[PDB]
Structure formats: C-alpha cells, structure tokens
Amino acid sequence: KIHHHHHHMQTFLKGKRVGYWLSEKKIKKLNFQAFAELCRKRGMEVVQLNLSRPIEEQGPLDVIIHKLTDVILEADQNDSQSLELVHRFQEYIDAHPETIVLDPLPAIRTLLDRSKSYELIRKIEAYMEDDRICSPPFMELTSLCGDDTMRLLEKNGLTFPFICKTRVAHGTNSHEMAIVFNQEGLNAPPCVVQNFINHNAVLYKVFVVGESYTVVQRPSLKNFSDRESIFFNSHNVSKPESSSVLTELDKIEGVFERPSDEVIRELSRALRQALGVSLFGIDIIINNQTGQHAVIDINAFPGYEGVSEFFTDLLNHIATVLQGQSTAMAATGDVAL
Ligand SMILES: Nc1ncnc2c1ncn2[C@@H]1O[C@H](COP(=O)(O)OP(=O)(O)NP(=O)(O)O)[C@@H](O)[C@H]1O
Ligand SMILES: [Mn+2]
Numbered sequence: 517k518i519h520h521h522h523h524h525m526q527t528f529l530k531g532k533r534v535g536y537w538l539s540e541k542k543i544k545k546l547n548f549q550a551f552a553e554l555c556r557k558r559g560m561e562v563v564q565l566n567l568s569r570p571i572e573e574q575g576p577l578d579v580i581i582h583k584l585t586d587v588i589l590e591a592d593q594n595d596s597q598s599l600e601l602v603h604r605f606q607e608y609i610d611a612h613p614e615t616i617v618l619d620p621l622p623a624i625r626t627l628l629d630r631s632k633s634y635e636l637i638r639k640i641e642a643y644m645e646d647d648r649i650c651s652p653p654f655m656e657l658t659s660l661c662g663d664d665t666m667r668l669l670e671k672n673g674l675t676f677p678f679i680c681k682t683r684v685a686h687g688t689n690s691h692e693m694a695i696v697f698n699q700e701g702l703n704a705p706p707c708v709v710q711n712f713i714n715h716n717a718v719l720y721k722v723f724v725v726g727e728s729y730t731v732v733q734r735p736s737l738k739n740f741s742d743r744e745s746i747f748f749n750s751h752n753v754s755k756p757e758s759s760s761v762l763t764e765l766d767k768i769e770g771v772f773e774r775p776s777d778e779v780i781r782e783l784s785r786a787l788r789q790a791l792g793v794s795l796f797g798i799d800i801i802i803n804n805q806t807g808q809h810a811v812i813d814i815n816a817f818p819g820y821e822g823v824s825e826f827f828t829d830l831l832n833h834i835a836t837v838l839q840g841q842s843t844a845m846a847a848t849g850d851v852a853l
C-alpha cells in the first residue's frame with residue numbers, strides 16, 4: 517500500500533552533478549556529508565559550492581540544493597558581502613536554466629516575511645475551500661501601539677489572545693514572540709500579530725521533501741485574561757527536547773485529533789505548486805474549538821529533526837525533479853486542485 521516508487525527514476529541519477537550551498541552549521545546539523553555519500557553510491561557527483569568563486573568552473577551542475585535564506589536576509593539589509601554572493605548565484609542561475617534549483621530564490625523570498633507568507637497561505641486556503649482548514653486572522657502592525665490600535669485589530673479580526681512575531685521569518689532576531697491577552701498588554705511593534713489558537717499543546721511539524729512528507733509531533737504552547745503579556749523565544753518552545761511551563765498542558769480541552777493526511781496532501785501540493793518550494797516545513801496545529809487545521813508557521817529548508825527518512829526522501833526528490841525536467845513536466849495555468 518505504498519504505490520509510488522522511485523527505483524526506475526533513480527536509474528537516471530548516474531553521472532548527474534549536484535552543487536550545494538549550506539552554512540557550515542547547517543552542514544553539521546544535517547550531517548550533510550552522509551547525504552553526499554548516499555548520492556555517490558548512485559553514481560552522482562556532489563560538490564559543495566563556494567559562492568566567492570566563479571561558479572562556471574564549479575559546474576556543470578544539474579541540480580543545486582541550497583539554503584541561502586540568511587544570506588538573502590543579510591543582502592536585504594545591504595550587507596555588501598551577502599549581496600555579492602547572491603548576485604553571483606543569481607547571475608549563474610540566470611545563465612543556466614538547465615540547472616534545477618532547490619529551491620528557486622523567488623520561492624524562498626516568499627517565506628522570508630511572515631506577513632507575506634501568512635497571506636499566501638490564506639489565499640491558497642481560500643482557493644482550496646476545505647472546511648477542515650482555517651487561517652488564523654493576522655496582520656502586520658507597523659506603528660507603536662496607541663489610541664487606534666484596538667480598532668485596527670478589531671477590523672482585521674484580531675482577538676485576544678494573539679501572538680506577536682517578527683516580520684522577518686528566520687535568523688537572528690526572528691524568534692522573540694509575545695502573547696497579548698488584553699488591552700493593557702498592548703506595549704508588546706513592528707511585528708506580525710496572529711490570533712492564538714488553543715490546540716492542546718501539540719504541534720504537528722509537517723516536514724516536506726517534495727513529493728513526500730513526514731509529520732513530527734513537537735511540544736507546543738499550552739491552552740489559555742487580566743494577565744501580563746507573555747514574552748518567550750521560540751527556540752525554547754517546540755524543539756524535540758523542549759520543556760517549560762509554557763508548553764505544559766493543564767488538561768485536554770475540546771477537539772483533540774491528529775491532522776488529516778488528506779488535508780496535509782492538499783496543502784503540500786498547493787504550497788509546492790503555487791510557491792515553487794519543495795524543501796520546507798509547515799507547522800500545523802489542530803484548533804480545539806473547530807478541529808480545523810491551522811498553519812501557524814512555514815519554513816524554508818528546516819532542520820528535519822525526527823525525519824529519519826530525510827536522506828532517502830531528498831534523493832527521491834532529486835530523482836523526481838530530474839525526471840520532470842527530462843520529460844518537460846512543467847506546470848501550466850493555475851494550481852490544479
Ligand atoms: N497562532 C498561534 N496559536 C497558537 N500557538 C502558536 C501560534 N503561533 C505559534 N504558536 C506556538 O508558538 C511556537 C513558535 O511559533 P512559530 O511561528 O512556529 O515560531 P518559529 O520561530 O517560526 N519556529 P520554527 O521556524 O519552527 O523554528 C509554535 O511552535 C507554537 O507552539
Ligand atoms: Mn514553528
């Protein structure tokens with residue numbers, strides 16, 4: 517009852533060349549060298565790219581795998597070195613349409629800004645019109661709180677409690693968040709605000725590798741107010757070993773179910789097809805009042821901690837994308853639901 521296989525498309529991996537750009541920290545966390553070993557066994561060449569060096573000489577490349585997210589974010593902040601790297605990368609990609617990029621920079625850029633990403637998820641969900649899915653109201657606050665803040669929140673469907681997150685979606689200075697419970701709590705901007713959804717303190721990290729995904733359960737904020745706003749760093753909340761009073765559920769309340777694979781599949785397809793990403797995660801929580809799936813976070817090329825099949829899935833996705841290119845499997849028109 518696994519019906520999709522890759523043995524045949526894996527036969528074309530021989531002689532293919534894969535370039536990757538990952539930070540040394542990410543190479544370590546992934547044990548990416550072990551993936552490189554796996555590919556060599558199928559007759560692939562894998563090489564780490566150096567974006568300080570002309571890229572022509574480093575190719576030909578059939579595929580590039582990267583996580584340039586933070587270099588892009590630095591280049592956005594006018595870091596001269598990062599700009600140089602991105603320009604070089606971009607020049608090369610532009611010159612080599614035959615090179616499959618996992619994932620395209622336009623796709624990456626969508627996930628760099630929380631508000632933009634949440635709006636894309638909202639639009640995608642409106643298009644899918646599945647009553648099993650909900651988009652928590654969200655908005656971006658740019659001005660410091662004041663006399664009009666309450667009415668601004670209200671007209672955008674923001675309610676207490678809501679969680680405050682940075683607009684920048686990754687890197688240094690992206691993990692500090694707040695939960696605001698009442699009007700007095702409104703000193704906690706700029707930031708994105710998103711209605712807090714009680715979900716019985718279980719996060720379902722959907723780790724997507726192209727055509728396959730793995731769901732990994734993580735600790736998550738408890739259910740919840742004259743109380744002081746809560747400030748926390750998301751590093752401390754939803755890691756495998758995370759444990760704190762913020763994630764200790766008092767008791768199961770309301771609807772408590774696991775996510776629907778049918779729903780995850782439709783979300784995965786729609787996000788992949790609309791945005792062009794393939795190596796990403798979406799964080800799903802199950803609303804305890806409605807049972808609906810809420811996507812509260814989307815991340816380009818995350819850690820995949822707990823995804824033991826990550827390497828074989830990655831290899832299968834490289835085989836698939838090569839198969840797609842070889843047979844001109846380009847999508848046309850709108851996302852086909
Ligand atoms: N709208 C929400 N309702 C309820 N809980 C939430 C909501 N948004 C975030 N959380 C919780 O807060 C945690 C951190 O929020 P998240 O937006 O995933 O941060 P992040 O820094 O982008 N995490 P990650 O990229 O997965 O390392 C989540 O794992 C949930 O436990
Ligand atoms: Mn998250």
Ligand SMILES: [Mn+2]
Pocket residue numbers: 685813814815
């Ligand atoms: Mn995130």
